[model samples]
Target chain A: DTHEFHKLLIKVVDLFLEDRIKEFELKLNTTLDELEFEELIGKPDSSNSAENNGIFIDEYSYDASENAIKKLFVEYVRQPEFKYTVLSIKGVNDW
Target chain B: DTHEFHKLLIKVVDLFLEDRIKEFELKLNTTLDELEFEELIGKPDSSNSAENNGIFIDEYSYDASENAIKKLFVEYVRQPEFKYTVLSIKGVNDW
Candidate 1:
């Protein structure tokens, strides 16, 4: 079912969350300490301040976040296991 | 210069070549075998036949191949090392 697909997608997202963060940190040349990064991961939003707790306050920050999210989505869908599972489901569903 | 960027791109491409092929094999539920996979890696062409040596003759195969290539490109650019290098170059070039 589509629900299964959605669940798989979430699993993939969670699987790569750390990698995404690391990539983001590398790209931005800034380290997102465990607490800071986790805070943003838990509550992602652009309406944040420029203080120690705020995240994604600038245009470039938002762009990097968007790019990281996009990368996660792309990576998840491109996985062989995920693609095969989706294809099998589609075959059974005849869609 | 852009030449440095292009060189880095080639390096990243070469780094992920094996991963892309493996992903393709998994998605298609087929084994490329070392020789066959290497042949295509050396000369990727979609205008082949359905023979044992032919690669990417059908639309689905072509689509999968395209997806794999796209993934490689995304992965390369998203890499912290590559992104940082590119950003550093851009900063130096003032572009």
Candidate 2:
């Protein structure tokens, strides 16, 4: 009977639809077809859904392997212009 | 016949390919050919084509008013560790 320990930390970054014009343009072009364009981008009621989002994260470990992963995430965030928000930080240990 | 008012708002978004994974993996514990990688990343199809696969916009109004366009374009979508997208409600305009 061996028990393993695992820790998981989750961080979420959410960029709202306020200044996400470019992001919305990209998604609009990628997700919906021209035939469905009216539903996606056409003028609609005020209650129409607005989905403009992008998530970029940096996760580093307290250890070496984790350090490397964290390094990658840090390097990514280092890029001056990026849109995201840190949503949450969670830790879990499993055996 | 003086129609002095003109508005040109052409928004084109095209993402035709599959997801991009290799974009997130940085060369670790190994040597990489910088020049080749740059060229490849620039070009979308060739082996060493990191020259220009997307939009080629005008920086500092590079060429002239005739060539002073603000945005560039790409035909495919790739989501690495980070992903982004957007759309317009007021409609795409020069901002």
Candidate 3:
């Protein structure tokens, strides 16, 4: 497809249609083809069907070691300052 | 075009094209047309040019009180068991 940042959106659309987007989770760390995804979830989740409906794209910040993201999430939750850093996306911008 | 959940992905691509998707952040909780986003970010981020590349769709789990996500992120960071439950996406399913 197109190579603009918009193309990331296109790839996201493709991954969602195939239901293989969960692999993007840092904790998951592996891309599963549709069949592999089903087999992974097949009868294991009981009623996990409902929550899987939306296609969640990965936050670049969360696209790290599972430990990193988990720690970051907790830190953000407890501190408004941390949350501002993340959502406001402020950082060491030298320019 | 189609409502088969895939449309959500299409919507993602749409919002991203317009660069107004950050308004979906629970912390912000307001939709902004392109100009508004610019007015909001204008001269504020300094060199925040790098972090905004990816189109991160909202997670159903994180689609809650800001407190909820911050706490959850911290808790998952510390506990592997909680991490498993989240990545595995487990819950009270009566089925």
Candidate 4:
């Protein structure tokens, strides 16, 4: 169940983050920018709806510039009416 | 443990969202710009830092505009290194 939810979440991020990732690369002066974000974060496993039905995406804290986003946050719900879940994730380029 | 983690997470969000929430209000044309964000999402319960541990934030998909963040994502780590965690949250105004 956990793995399935992650699969769908991956697609959602890919959808929302394409442009921001490029911006991040630009900010960092990263060259060969085309595949950097996808490469750094990895890509979606599958797009089939069947594989991703248990999660509903919700509010996120989004801003441009890495300095502006030290700690990233996302809140979502798992399908079948599970209680809401919140995660405060690690920032990109933190390592 | 979960509650403790959440308490710290609340602090992290408050820190990151102070400006983003204001901007969201501006974008949505909401008056009373001051308290909308801290109101929409509850303020941090405690900033003592003693209550929040075991969470190291990582990469987050952060951008402006509500549409830009329909599906917000955050990647984080639990303390004692218990593997990474991710959450795809609901949109801010997605009632």
Candidate 5:
């Protein structure tokens, strides 16, 4: 499901955006829109496996000192399957 | 971008996975595969925003004693736009 949509996402965004925003939009779109990506970044969720499923979006500007994203990504890569998933997507998609 | 893909994801997963597993897989896919969703789960990230983008997967059989996911969701709902986004997706997606 996400796979097909993910593919379409890149294709459509590529179709609409012509340059940096296109790339930026894709990065932002994939980051802010996908649920899987959001979870790995430490955004927080109830994890109610039975009833938890959906799309989400968030945009925030932080202080340069915050370093929240970097910290989160580090932790994100340490998880077993998550790191594999990240590598899978990055390997195939080049982001 | 995620809007269209999200829809397709739900549709496709619905077609393949069966019954509880279908639902479970959907939930898992949405939470694990999409970058946006992972970010919200407290998994961690680098926050580069510019260079950080991709799908990821993780599977961990944790002790029921651990409430990491629950804790994260609580914090996740407190964010200004994140809460709104959650409400929006939940209202439309039923998750």
Candidate 6:
């Protein structure tokens, strides 16, 4: 259940962070293929939404899980020059 | 110098988090005065901009400090239901 929740959490981060990753790669002059990028961001298992329902069904559990994921996402994105990089990106569109 | 940088960092957080704090108070069905709210958010020293020059003048140091502050800010905002609260507040305006 916990793992499932984390997977969904990672999915949320992936949604917001996808563009930032591309920007990061361009800035660093390096390419990160899917596997390498996933590793750098850490991986979650490949599972479908039907398997993710149990955890999301419980309101308290869902809140806790979402909070955990948000924390992780924030920490991950704020590292090093990434903070300034994210800030420099114009507008709140990505946010 | 480090302190000044942290102050600036906290200032940035305060800017983004002010409205959220009001929303949080309303949702909790409780009141937090200015002092209490600042305490909840933790206090920083009061120094004017002219006094904050040395650290901001250094590019490397400035970047590092900004990152540190961003990390702190993300952690602060994402706690418990606050994450969902922030998420539900519509659009990227507050971001």
Interface RMSD over true interface Cα atoms for each candidate: 13.8, 14.3, 13.6, 11.7, 13.9, 17.8
Best by TM-score: 1
* Better-scoring candidate (lDDT), 5 or 6: 5
The top-ranked prediction according to DockQ is 1
B1-95: candidate 1 lDDT, tens digit per residue: 33332333233233234332122211112122333333323333332323233222221122224334323211111222223112110000000
| Candidate 3: segments with Cα more than 4 A from true spot | A1-22, A25-95, B22-95
TM-scores for every predicted model: 0.20, 0.16, 0.19, 0.18, 0.18, 0.18
Q: After superposition, how far is residue B88 of candidate 1 from its true place, in Å?
A: 23
DockQ for all candidate structures vs. native: 0.04, 0.02, 0.03, 0.02, 0.02, 0.04
Task: Name the weakest run of 10 consecutive residues (lDDT summed) in model 4 chain A.
Answer: A22-31
Ranking by lDDT: 4, 5, 1, 3, 6, 2
Predicted complex 5: DockQ:
0.02
- Model 3 Cα lDDT, one tens digit per residue, B1-95: 22232334334323422333332211111233333323322231112121123322211222223332211110011122221111111111010
CA lDDT for candidate 1: 0.24
Query: Residue A10 CA error for candidate 1 (Å)?
Result: 0.8
- Each model's fraction of native contacts: 0.00, 0.00, 0.00, 0.00, 0.00, 0.00
Worst 10 residues of 6 chain A by lDDT: A20-29
How would you encode candidate 3's per-residue C-alpha lDDT over A1-95 as one tens digit per residue?
A: 22232333334324422333432211111223333322322231112111123333221222223332211110011122221111211111010
Clashes of 6: 0
Candidate 4 residue-wise lDDT, A1-95, digit = tens: 33333333343244234322211100011112223222323432221211135543222334435544222223233323333332222223221
Candidate 3 colliding pairs:
A70-B77, A71-B77, A73-B73, A73-B74, A74-B73, A74-B74, A77-B70
Pick by lDDT: 2 or 6, better one: 6
Quick one: RMSD of model 4? Answer: 18.3
TM-score of chain A of 4: 0.24
Docking quality level of the chain pair in candidate 1 = incorrect
- Winner by TM-score between candidate 6 and candidate 3: 3
